[PDB]
Amino acid sequence: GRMKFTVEREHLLKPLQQVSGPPTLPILGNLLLQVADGTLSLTGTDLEMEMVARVALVQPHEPGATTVPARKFFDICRGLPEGAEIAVQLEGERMLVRSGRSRFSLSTLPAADFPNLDDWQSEVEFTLPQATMKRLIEATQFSMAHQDVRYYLNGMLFETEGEELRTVATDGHRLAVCSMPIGQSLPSHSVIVPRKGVIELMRMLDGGDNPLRVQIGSNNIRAHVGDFIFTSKLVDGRFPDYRRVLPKNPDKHLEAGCDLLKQAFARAAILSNEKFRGVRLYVSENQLKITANNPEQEEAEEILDVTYSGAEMEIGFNVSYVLDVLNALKCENVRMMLTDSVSSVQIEDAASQSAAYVVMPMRL
Amino acid sequence: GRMKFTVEREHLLKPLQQVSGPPTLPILGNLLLQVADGTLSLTGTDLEMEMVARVALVQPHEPGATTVPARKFFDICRGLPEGAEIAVQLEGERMLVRSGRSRFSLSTLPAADFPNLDDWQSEVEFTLPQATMKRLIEATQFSMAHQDVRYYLNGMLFETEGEELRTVATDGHRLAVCSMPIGQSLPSHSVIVPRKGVIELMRMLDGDNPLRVQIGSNNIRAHVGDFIFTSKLVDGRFPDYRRVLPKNPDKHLEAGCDLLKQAFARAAILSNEKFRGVRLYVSENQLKITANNPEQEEAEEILDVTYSGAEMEIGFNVSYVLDVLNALKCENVRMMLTDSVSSVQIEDAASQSAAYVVMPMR
Amino acid sequence: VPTLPXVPXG
Amino acid sequence: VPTLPXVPXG
């Protein structure tokens, strides 16, 4: 075709990287390039999610479209020297890229075969800081399942209610939930965002002062950041209700230092079973004792001063799940809410209820 | 036994890390601990090499010896808080570690079963700065073969001659050689250090203070501070790097290290993923690099260089070339060519201490 | 290794 | 992919 444009490397680099979401169909390894109305559009897709970037063209150009290998094109522009000028044109089934005395000829596929994602009605719409979205995902991402028969557990639930956005993730043995205000009256809506959507979501946040705008629409979610738009399919299924796995009346409240508890569990875990990773907790008046044994009959014991005045109790835990929660809390004091040795425990930051974590015990 | 000692975590941390740098035999996963004469000794081995560290015991202690799982003991000590004191004593088939209100009971194996390396006669002996040894290895390590049937190519040659120590590595396609002066009259000797020995050698380096080396007919030893490393040599015949250096490479090309590297890196994007072949056209004060892949895509680079010889075109594995440029970390590089089917020699334009030879492709 | 009581699933 | 002139081996 007639497509032709010339742009600075510095204006093309971040656009290219973001649409290059790091063994597919031939066309799906390519970016769609579109020149039109002083704008260059770059699109990458995998039939389930889609990333579009827009770049303003201040130099002469000619409208047109084509597709080119995404990674090769990004590596070419990234390999050029800082401040380089990149001129692009079409020549039959080839795209010629020129910068200085560097010449590149990339094979293309017609743009008419690049798949467009059909339209969908937005049902919920809101904007929130990038830092808020970052906190919601980092608080729960680790609890997601991976390649679970229940395809709905591989993703992360995104729930709206009143003034708050909520994320939930669970693999069947432990659960994480986190709610954040965003200062807008929103409808109620529950959707599941697949694992890869969560990742791509995280990738879009540049920790800048450009708010994030979300559109949720039954079977699709969309996110806007600056000149970037990410669209992903949702997972069709019913997510379990976190309210029904929260322990009722966990009246045995233990409070301990975040860091000291973590170091004690990390040390005990050295002599725990490599497969099951079980540690044993003995809770008594203002004292917590952690023990661990492995098939080799090695033993570890930790004693910590804590705040606790309830009944004595013995309870076992996968220490990896406990450490996962403590690292996600990044807290100064942690609160554990216990019921009995065979019931789930709720763990929270002692001074914040925004996030909550539920972990099932083991039998030892 | 009676073994017992109490030592600050900080005095035990780095020693433990150096010796426990390795799923083989149970005893080979264990450190040999020895208390004797106000000194704690930690030894780790893999049957082919061993590392020994010595720590001073300023607190009461009782002599004795045992073996304990290395990784677990290290992780326990490193997991204890800063400034912690670690008390160790034996309780039958177990070692008890105590620090604060933390208690650990590790299984042991008898020290009498920890394998001893045979004694050997030192034939060459010298000392040199750690930075010098660092330079010698970093200059050639990347050229070693990996899992080559020619067992002797999997290691690194260490050759003494006159005043210089030399290192040589090659995989049959490229070769690296680096010679440094150490200011001592040395006997001519040539021995092959195995791959894992080279790695451990680098681990125990930091870069001005001295490093003492002892080479024998079948073993090599290195002393650094309170550490002693010993490895078995590779029993074979290493090729002669003199016989692969091109004779009379009269075509001399000089170019910018960085500019040449970036050009090769861009061209490599469209080279064959398996063979990685790029083509170099050399002409008067100009170099042109081209690449092609099966999908018929094409790259081209043109650089200004210093060259006045006959025109020539020659192919290369662009990965081997980039490896050399990454190793030189140079301002200007010098390529010495002969013809399109002969090896090339690459060096830092302002340093002859290291040289690289790379065979072309068709 | 009992589970979170999802309904079903546990 | 010819080799360094090594005897034997090339």
Numbering used by the authors:
A (entry chain A): -1 to 20, 25 to 366
B (entry chain B): -1 to 20, 25 to 208, 210 to 365
C (entry chain C), D (entry chain D): 2 to 11
List sentences quoted exactly from the publication behind this structure.
Griselimycins (GMs) are such promising anti-TB antibiotics that bind and inhibit the mycobacterial DNA polymerase III sliding clamp (DnaN). Although the co-crystal of msDnaN and MP A could not be obtained after intensive attempts, DnaN of E. coli (ecDnaN) was overproduced in E. coli and co-crystallized with MP A, GM and cyclohexyl-GM (CGM). Despite sharing only 29 % sequence identity with msDnaN, the binding pocket of ecDNA shows a sufficient degree of conservation. The binding pocket can be divided into a larger (subsite 1) and a smaller cavity (subsite 2) and as has been shown previously for GM and mycobacterial DnaN, all compounds occupy both subsites of the binding pocket.
The crystal structures were solved at resolutions of 2.12 Å (MP A), 1.65 Å (GM) and 1.50 Å (CGM). MP A was found to bind in the same mode to ecDnaN as GM or CGM. All three substances form hydrogen bonds to only 2 – 3 protein residues, but the additional oxygen in the N-terminal α-keto butyrate residue of MP A provides a second hydrogen bond acceptor for Arg365, which is also conserved in mycobacterial DnaN. The compounds bind mainly via van der Waals interactions with interfaces ranging from 550 Å2 for GM to 590 Å2 for CGM to 600 Å2 for MP A. Compared to available structures of uncomplexed DnaN, only a few residues undergo significant conformational changes upon binding of the compounds - most notably Met362, which has been described to function as a gate between the subsites. The linear, N-terminal part of the ligands in subsite 2 superimposes almost perfectly, while MP A seems to be tilted slightly (approximately 7-10 ° compared to GM/CGM) away from the protein in the region around Pro8. This tilting can be attributed to the longer 5-methyl-l-norleucine residue of MP A at position 6, whereas leucine is present at the same position in GM and CGM. In the complex with msDnaN, GM adopts a conformation very similar to that of MP A in the ecDnaN complex, although GM lacks the 5-methyl-l-norleucine at position 6 and the residues lining the protein pocket around this position are conserved between mycobacteria and E. coli. In comparison to GM and CGM, the higher potency of MP A might be attributed to the increased hydrophobicity of the substance and the larger van der Waals interface with DnaN. The 5-methyl-l-norleucine at position 6 might also play a role by pushing the generally less-tight bound region around Pro8 out of the binding pocket but stabilizing the tighter interaction around the ligand’s bifurcation. The co-crystal structure of ecDnaN bound with MP A and the nanomolar binding affinity of MPs to msDnaN validates DnaN as the molecular target.
